[PDB]
Amino acid sequence: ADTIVAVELDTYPNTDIGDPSYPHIGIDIKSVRSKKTAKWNMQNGKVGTAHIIYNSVDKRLSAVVSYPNADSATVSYDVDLDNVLPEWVRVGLSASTGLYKETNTILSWSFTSKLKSNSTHETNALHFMFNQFSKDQKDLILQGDATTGTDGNLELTRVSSNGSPQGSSVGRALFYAPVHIWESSAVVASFEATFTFLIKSPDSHPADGIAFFISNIDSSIPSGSTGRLLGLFPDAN
Amino acid sequence: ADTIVAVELDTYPNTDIGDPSYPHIGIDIKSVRSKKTAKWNMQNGKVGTAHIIYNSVDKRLSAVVSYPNADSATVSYDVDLDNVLPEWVRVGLSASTGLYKETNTILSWSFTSKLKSNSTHETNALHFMFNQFSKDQKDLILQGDATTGTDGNLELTRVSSNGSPQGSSVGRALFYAPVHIWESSAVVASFEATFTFLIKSPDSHPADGIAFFISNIDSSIPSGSTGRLLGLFPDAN
Ligand SMILES: CCN(CC)c1ccc2c(c1)Oc1cc(N(CC)CC)ccc1C2c1ccccc1C(=O)OCCOCCOCCOCCn1cc(CO[C@H]2O[C@H](CO)[C@@H](O)[C@H](O)[C@@H]2O)nn1
Ligand SMILES: CCN(CC)c1ccc2c(c1)Oc1cc(N(CC)CC)ccc1C2c1ccccc1C(=O)OCCOCCOCCOCCn1cc(CO[C@H]2O[C@H](CO)[C@@H](O)[C@H](O)[C@@H]2O)nn1
Ligand SMILES: [Ca+2]
Ligand SMILES: [Ca+2]
Ligand SMILES: [Cl-]
Ligand SMILES: [Mn+2]
Ligand SMILES: [Mn+2]
Fold this sequence. Notes:
Chain A has one helix and 16 strands. Chain A is mostly beta strands. β9 of chain A pairs antiparallel with β9 of chain B.
């Protein structure tokens, strides 16, 4: 099975598998049942921003989601990455719909990682930034329904000709290169990610959400992970 | 056959392919016969640094090689990358030995590329930095004889357990992800690369050199490209 660390922007309450009763952001460590959540006043049709940060000094994974002129939703959690992930991983965005639906449109995505070994500036780093996406975005691995379209955006889940979202869709985008996120010789390991997103839904209840995730390098969309499993997990354990 | 743009640090004069009669730096555009060169006072067994810069404003590819407390060697040449390379490329380092030999050790390597589209801050960027190479360096594609060591270095060509280099060796390391180096809607496409290198020879005569190159994404070492072809070119044309 894949190993997943994720921050979920969960638009649909699946109370029967642990979700609080409202849209929420959550920190997911090898399970769709979030280790920590916070209430998220999601806004239909508006562009939001997510920021995810980790450092190995405090060993705290944190995330904040916001819209311009609204209160932010924020969540933090203890995590030792040497403990949960392999040394080398890929990073990605995932989204899904199920019975209920929403656009899962990514307008920008940036990531930076740094791994300072043993010595006094002996730092390896990777940074990438996408402020638009091309039709052939060769440095992304697109999985499932994910496409990079005419608009210059990444559509994680299937969108019709008119821009209207489709149900029972799942897609991910992974950065092409593996990332060295820990090494036992590192004096400080750290990363950050940011992305801007447009979740819009004709439905009463949008579903199901978007996540930034870190996985084993050979991760793929697990079977039956559309809808509530957010393209990340094979089951709800 | 591959499409190659390179900066060569050429330690061995092959004057029958237009090398000048001394070690030299050169700019190579689809041929081992450099479009331009400058004399380079190579220093056997000392750590040197190379810096390669390109912007699409001036459309000029420039390179400097130096050692601490020595004069530098510099070369520049007109290059429209859109006219030479595909939109997507890989970036790498190559070296070879032939009948004469040298260590072709890389101690660090960084690269940054930026592509500003149509719009006003519509920048995509990639940056990586290796100040130490690990034994399993998963974000490098190693070709031929190249290896990464538990000593933290990248040996592009074959070195024996006792430290002495081998003849008839060729090896390359390419960053794992494809790089978007130009786009027809770009206001500015630019990049820079730096590496530190250690070339040592027990011989009186070191050969053959190290190069930073940009290639078609599917580039591989041309058959028989040891010696003067620097692992870059299938022939001397
Ligand atoms: C919200 C209004 N409700 C509550 C009244 C609702 C909505 C749809 C069905 C519901 C109930 O019940 C059944 C029951 C059955 N049974 C078998 C004959 C008896 C167990 C079969 C189909 C449905 C549907 C349904 C019919 C047609 C097409 C698809 C679905 C569907 O996917 O249901 C979900 C899975 O079914 C199997 C068990 O079902 C109970 C689970 O929990 C029940 C509460 N529930 C279901 C859902 C929507 O779940 C889907 O969409 C979600 C949002 O996109 C995703 O998170 C989720 O993964 C799934 O895709 N939300 N809450
Ligand atoms: C293994 C013992 N060694 C090492 C001690 C060895 C063996 C033979 C030679 C050696 C060295 O050196 C030279 C040097 C010269 N020079 C000019 C007066 C001085 C710059 C001329 C000939 C030789 C020969 C030699 C003599 C007779 C018959 C054939 C060769 C021969 O090199 O054939 C080799 C292949 O050739 C094909 C290319 O053909 C046009 C080249 O133009 C000729 C000028 N030349 C050849 C060389 C060396 O080329 C090899 O080594 C280079 C350095 O590693 C590589 O750049 C090159 O690709 C090739 O591996 N350098 N200049
Ligand atoms: Ca949910
Ligand atoms: Ca030469
Ligand atoms: Cl590729
Ligand atoms: Mn949830
Ligand atoms: Mn030359």
